Ligand binder design. Structure first.
Ligand SMILES: COc1cccc(/C=C2\SC(=S)NC2=O)c1
Ligand SMILES: COc1cccc(/C=C2\SC(=S)NC2=O)c1
Lengths: 327, 327
């Protein structure tokens, strides 16, 4: 960190939901997403160095595997943390990972390095940005399955709301900037896919402390500007992980804060490979030519959906390399 | 770090074989060794601060469980690494741990901090001590099951000797100090117990590069001065882990190196709880009173061995709190 005299500006890189280590459609045609994903991450890291960001915010789901992440996935994560730390201080709000050692590793790494901070509790942390700016981090991670295992919905809502009220109180005692970091699902998300075999946490967007200068959220795979006061953004994932994300905007966001003035932000589009679902009434020869000609010019991955039985289908996937799913 | 110019001294703390997380005699009377072990570790840390050591060497088997160490064990390990890093730079040569993430964690931690170094290959690493001394580390870790799985005794030994000769060559290109770090069993160890359910690596003490200023070894639970030139020491464990270690010396060592002068070292005794095996031919009333009177005054843990059947034994362990095993 430089010790440039405390300024009124704060340039922020905010990215999340990397899902490192993911292989899509493993039970039809496994496609390792690593090359496309690293291509998107390199784009984000390079853009941050170009824009000379002061702070880097990561808000979880950086690894696809919640249980046993591959050595390759863990290597890429620590690799990209290292590259970002060389650019600006990094604050990491991890997702709902399964092994408890992560909290000990995170606290240990936070203790031995000034360039990275792991926030894994509801307790706020003050950090210093690249140009000396003092930033109070208001963290709101995934609570617990155990407290959720209470099964009483009423008290669990009250637990979360009391944690939010405290973060509001501590945001008032800020110095230069206060930044909220949360890993949850905003209530009533326009076009929310749904639960992917798991219990989710639903928070009303109005409960986010209005006095924070920026609300950095993760867990949602599409870019979403939730609200303007306080500015609340899901950056989205960097790749289209599965079909259903065909219309999502993918990338990161660059946020600039000035005291007393409204915040400005630009999207950093990852330019991800596209997805396409092909719907056919029946798989006939006229529909077969449509399938082949489409994939020959389509730079992404294709799914074919049909309900009318069309006999034993010809080896479409053994023939078409970017056709990954037929259902 | 201080940068003392033309410094000919290097004060070293060398400890190893902590076995954090161990619970002894789990199949007779489980005794959690954590309190005694942290008591010994605190003693070592305090002495290092008193002597103001320049470098701290750890040579493996710091955790008892090679597979899934408890969260408590990992927390204690990271806790004591943190305390030692505040005193002096730390070089860590880990033992044969099982999960592959350790090398990624180690390299990541090494990259972000100048006060800790993980050496997990045969590749030498240069480090800076507390007062600016340049130290070349010659690491010789436990290889792998795979290269040992060659099963050809001739080639495997030649591989190990090739690595040792290479470490000798790079030790010649030293700057101020060169330190050998190895995790293996020296050949022909006077009173060596044997293999504790595992294939071990046997190295002749003469193969250690004679040009190093100090040879820091781990894996053996007893203090052992292997040779004088180069000075080669097993520090031993900090507690008496199981019966058979009753007569071992336990603790760490404080080593001082001076250019052109012979090295000096002192033992730092851990003052561990003693162990005692009571051997009786037959468990009679005279042997029963002997067992009770002995343990009442013995500050450590006691094992009772007898071969002649003596009927249903009275609840000796239900009476004697430090009687942990009857076999
Ligand atoms: C699982 O070992 C590590 C080590 C370092 C960082 C992370 C971060 C994670 S994992 C997840 S899900 N979201 C995150 O931000 C995980
Ligand atoms: C298993 O996670 C960690 C994390 C940091 C250090 C170690 C060291 C070890 S493990 C072993 S056996 N010997 C050692 O020195 C292990």
């Amino acid at each position: 960190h430089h010790h440039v005299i405390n300024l009124k500006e704060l340039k922020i890189l905010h990215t999340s939901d990397w899902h490192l280590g993911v292989t899509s459609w493993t039970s039809s045609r496994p496609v390792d997403r690593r090359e496309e994903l690293k291509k998107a991450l390199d784009k984000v890291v390079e853009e941050a160095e170009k824009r000379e960001v002061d702070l880097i915010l990561l808000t979880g789901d950086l690894l696809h595997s919640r249980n046993n992440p591959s050595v390759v996935a863990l290597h890429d994560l620590l690799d990209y943390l290292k590259r970002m730390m060389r650019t600006a201080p990094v604050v990491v709000l991890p997702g709902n990972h399964d092994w408890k050692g992560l909290k000990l590793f995170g606290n240990f790494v936070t203790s031995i390095s000034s360039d990275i901070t792991f926030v894994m509790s509801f307790e706020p942390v003050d950090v210093e940005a690249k140009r000396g700016q003092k930033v109070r981090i208001l963290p709101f991670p995934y609570p617990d399955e155990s407290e959720a295992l209470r099964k009483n919905e009423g008290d669990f809502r009250f637990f979360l709301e009391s944690r939010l009220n405290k973060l509001y109180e501590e945001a008032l005692k800020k110095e230069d900037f206060a930044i909220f970091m949360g890993h949850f699902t905003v209530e009533g998300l326009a076009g929310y896919a749904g639960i992917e075999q798991g219990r989710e946490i639903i928070i009303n967007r109005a409960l986010i402390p209005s006095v924070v200068d920026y609300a950095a959220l993760g867990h949602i795979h599409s870019f979403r500007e939730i609200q303007k006061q306080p500015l609340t953004i899901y950056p989205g994932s960097l790749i289209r992980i599965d079909f259903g994300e065909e219309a999502d905007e993918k990338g990161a966001v660059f946020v600039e804060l000035k005291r007393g003035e409204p915040p400005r932000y630009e999207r950093i589009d990852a330019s991800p490979l596209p997805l396409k679902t092909l719907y056919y009434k029946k798989i006939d020869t006229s529909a077969l030519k449509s399938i082949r000609d489409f994939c020959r010019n389509f730079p992404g991955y294709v799914r074919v959906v049909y309900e009318e039985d069309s006999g034993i289908l010809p080896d479409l996937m053994g023939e078409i390399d970017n056709l990954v799913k037929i259902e």
